Design a protein around this ligand. Structure first.
Ligand SMILES: O=C(NO)c1ncc(-c2ccccc2Cl)o1
Ligand SMILES: [Mn+2]
Ligand SMILES: [Mn+2]
Length: 262
């Protein structure tokens, strides 16, 4: 049973998605050489709780001890904010935010490049966002998720990069993770024909080297097996009658919030 959101549910998800985007807009000017990831997480959690009057879905999730996940360079996902970990020139950094507001979740992440970019870091990030945007342009009633996952994979692999298989996007609303799974690669198991009112995330994790990953002994931090760079972007969307609506769009996105077909 994939849940179908009511109009009221969808407006709540606009609110929550807007707050999650706004955390990312807020944190931008702090993402500078020399800042700790510990400090970035405090700035985020203080903003979520004291200004947005919302809650982080990440905090305490399976015992996770911080409020956002911050994943630098070869860290693929779930990087733990750390007062001792300082950003530096050329770093690529994912900040992943999920807020709960009025009972509903907004989930989004983006890359930041710190200081002076490296060309490869810039390319990896660009192609990862472009794979998300290609997928968003496909979402409409009647399309199969499988076609989307296949398309993401084809695009990323042509650039000589790889798609992480172990993580996927997901349904979302009153639960952080709801059906369906949104694989970013082709699988004979995927057969979900989209309908208006479905809400879910698309969030490909792309490695510059090989697809395999490894979890660290801390129980949280996931890295590329080959220590290649890895990048991720994520939006929360609703399927509309003629396409979709991006609920976590930021000023810096370069795709329209409302995508119509016909
Ligand atoms: O869909 C997600 N992010 O976009 C998500 N799923 C699981 C987790 C998680 C895993 C380990 C630590 C903290 C968190 Cl938030 O994040
Ligand atoms: Mn997320
Ligand atoms: Mn997610």
């Amino acid at each position: 049973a994939i849940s179908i959101k009511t109009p009221e549910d969808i407006e709540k998800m606009r609110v929550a998605g807007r707050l999650a985007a706004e955390v990312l807009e807020m944190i931008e000017p702090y993402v500078k050489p020399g800042v700790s990831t510990g400090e970035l997480d405090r700035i985020c959690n203080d903003y979520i709780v004291n200004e947005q009057h919302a809650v982080s879905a990440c905090l305490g999730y399976h015992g996770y001890p911080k409020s956002v996940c911050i994943s630098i360079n070869e860290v693929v996902c779930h990087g733990i904010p750390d007062d001792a970990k300082l950003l530096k020139d050329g770093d690529i950094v994912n900040i992943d935010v999920t807020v709960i507001k009025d009972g509903f979740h907004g989930d989004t992440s983006k890359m930041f490049i710190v200081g002076k970019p490296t060309i490869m870091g810039e390319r990896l990030c660009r192609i990862t966002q472009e794979s998300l945007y290609l997928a968003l342009r496909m979402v409409k009633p009647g399309i199969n998720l499988r076609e989307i996952g296949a398309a993401i994979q084809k695009f990323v692999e042509a650039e000589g990069f790889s798609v992480v298989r172990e993580y996927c996007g997901h349904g979302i609303g009153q639960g952080f993770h709801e059906e369906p799974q949104v694989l970013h690669y082709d699988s004979r198991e995927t057969n979900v024909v989209l309908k208006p009112g479905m809400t879910f995330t698309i969030e490909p994790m792309v490695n510059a080297g090989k697809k395999e990953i490894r979890t660290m002994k801390d129980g949280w931090t996931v890295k590329t097996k080959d220590r290649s760079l890895s990048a991720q972007y994520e939006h929360t969307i609703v399927v509309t009658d003629n396409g979709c609506e991006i609920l976590t769009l930021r000023k810096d996105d370069t795709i329209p919030a409302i995508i119509s077909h016909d």
